[PDB]
Amino acid sequence: HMALSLANYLAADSAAEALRRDVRAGLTATQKSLPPKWFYDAVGSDLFDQITRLPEYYPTRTEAQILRTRSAEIISAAGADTLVELGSGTSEKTRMLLDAMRDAELLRRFIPFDVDAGVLRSAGAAIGAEYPGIEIDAVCGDFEEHLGKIPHVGRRLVVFLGSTIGNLTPAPRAEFLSTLADTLQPGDSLLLGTDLVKDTGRLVRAYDDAAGVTAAFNRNVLAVVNRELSADFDLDAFEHVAKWNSDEERIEMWLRARTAQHVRVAALDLEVDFAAGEEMLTEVSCKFRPENVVAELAEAGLRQTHWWTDPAGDFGLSLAVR
């Protein structure tokens, strides 16, 4: 139920100032963009959750099927008694790993790391109930600044699923993996999910679903700016566009102005203009080739010891060690 330890390294005032800096930079650039760090408020996070269940969004069920069939092998390979989860604690994927650790009579500790303390408290309560006696040490932080705050107690399996790593472009991605690798002791393991290059139509449809849910997620980034920075974006005036960028092998989401728009962002003392048809970059989702996953891990100081992939080659999971 309520047994918990929780450390909180994210302050409201610090987040508000970062949002102001990031939005000003994006909206005043000649090629406009909005910073994805701020897309995932409560509404945005729930819309993303819904995306994970859409028929076109293959990553979640694909990764789940890999875990469903290989979680025992993963847990045996890791030999860990402590599961560190980078992001959330709410998914069935988490429970597949915890269940396998319990089956192996190894499970002692769960360390969820996420930006939302409320979500962490919910996860603590649910997991504490399901695995009586488990120690839960939650960390509320940003995995680009607070990885050093993750406790080093135990033999730790650190998991970063969902190809969330694809939301980082190459420079911050390398910095993240390097920083993460530096926190791993001998005996610790990283389990990394990566969505793989594949048929471009399938890739684009995963981010442009027939039901319009991804489009709602995308437009909600404007609602966040409207609310937090007292802006007057007309959500209805922007069209959702998903593209495959073949040079960078990433999906890009864009908002395209239907007609010319004048936007006042009062909190920034800023007025910006969109031409009819002008596009603004929002979320990106980098996709990987299996050989390059090995190389990226090696560049960070990690050796890939295991690779699991579905039979169609849609998605991959790596286990890697120092």
Side-chain angles (χ1 to χ4, degrees), residues 2-263 265-322:
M2 290 173 182
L4 191 65
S5 127
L6 173 65
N8 197 325
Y9 300 104
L10 301 179
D13 56 345
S14 185
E17 58 177 55
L19 171 72
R20 282 167 174 72
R21 298 183 306 244
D22 297 344
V23 168
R24 177 184 300 281
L27 290 184
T28 62
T30 309
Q31 168 62 78
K32 295 177 175 68
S33 61
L34 283 171
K37 180 177 181 194
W38 308 107
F39 297 174
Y40 299 86
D41 70 330
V43 170
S45 294
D46 283 12
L47 284 165
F48 172 73
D49 179 69
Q50 292 176 53
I51 291 171
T52 73
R53 282 185 304 279
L54 299 172
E56 304 96 336
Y57 193 78
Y58 62 82
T60 308
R61 61 192 61 105
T62 306
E63 184 174 44
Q65 177 62 13
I66 297 169
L67 292 171
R68 184 175 294 112
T69 60
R70 295 292 193 171
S71 273
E73 191 197 354
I74 296 168
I75 291 318
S76 171
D81 59 14
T82 300
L83 182 67
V84 181
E85 183 175 347
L86 303 184
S88 316
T90 184
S91 75
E92 59 181 329
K93 294 181 296 183
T94 311
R95 289 170 185 267
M96 287 176 169
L97 292 162
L98 290 170
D99 281 354
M101 297 170 67
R102 171 164 56 187
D103 291 343
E105 297 179 342
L106 288 163
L107 185 53
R108 300 296 179 262
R109 183 176 302 99
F110 176 56
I111 301 171
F113 180 107
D114 194 84
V115 298
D116 188 316
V119 172
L120 293 169
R121 291 184 186 276
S122 294
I127 299 299
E130 174 56 35
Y131 308 88
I134 199 172
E135 174 181 322
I136 304 183
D137 303 310
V139 176
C140 181
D142 184 325
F143 54 68
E144 288 187 274
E145 173 161 340
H146 298 301
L147 296 178
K149 299 301 190 171
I150 298 168
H152 300 83
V153 57
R155 182 166 172 110
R156 299 178 305 142
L157 172 62
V158 178
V159 310
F160 192 33
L161 306 177
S163 203
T164 302
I165 195 165
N167 292 319
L168 298 173
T169 56
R173 186 162 76 236
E175 185 172 359
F176 166 84
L177 285 174
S178 171
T179 300
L180 184 50
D182 283 352
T183 72
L184 302 187
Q185 283 68 59
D188 296 340
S189 306
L190 171 66
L191 186 71
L192 182 68
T194 51
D195 194 15
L196 302 177
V197 176
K198 60 172 62 63
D199 180 83
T200 56
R202 293 183 55 217
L203 283 163
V204 172
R205 288 190 297 275
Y207 298 87
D208 194 19
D209 65 287
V213 177
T214 307
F217 166 82
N218 199 185
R219 277 191 277 268
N220 179 66
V221 314
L222 307 179
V224 174
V225 174
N226 282 349
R227 181 178 62 250
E228 297 301 318
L229 300 175
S230 303
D232 64 356
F233 282 105
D234 184 357
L235 271 65
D236 192 56
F238 291 86
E239 178 191 359
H240 173 69
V241 183
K243 301 181 188 182
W244 176 245
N245 176 339
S246 57
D247 296 326
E248 295 297 322
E249 292 187 347
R250 74 190 194 174
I251 284 292
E252 298 174 340
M253 292 166 31
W254 301 79
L255 292 168
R256 178 177 178 98
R258 296 180 192 291
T259 63
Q261 301 290 305
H262 183 76
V263 183
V265 186
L268 299 180
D269 292 354
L270 181 70
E271 303 190 86
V272 308
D273 292 284
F274 296 79
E278 180 171 350
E279 301 182 339
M280 174 173 57
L281 181 66
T282 61
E283 187 55 287
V284 304
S285 189
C286 301
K287 305 303 170 182
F288 298 88
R289 302 182 173 279
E291 61 267 33
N292 292 339
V293 175
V294 178
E296 288 198 26
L297 288 169
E299 176 188 35
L302 297 171
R303 184 173 80 267
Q304 185 197 73
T305 59
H306 302 256
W307 172 246
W308 297 276
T309 189
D310 61 290
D314 283 348
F315 198 99
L317 281 163
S318 299
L319 194 75
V321 303
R322 290 280 300 276

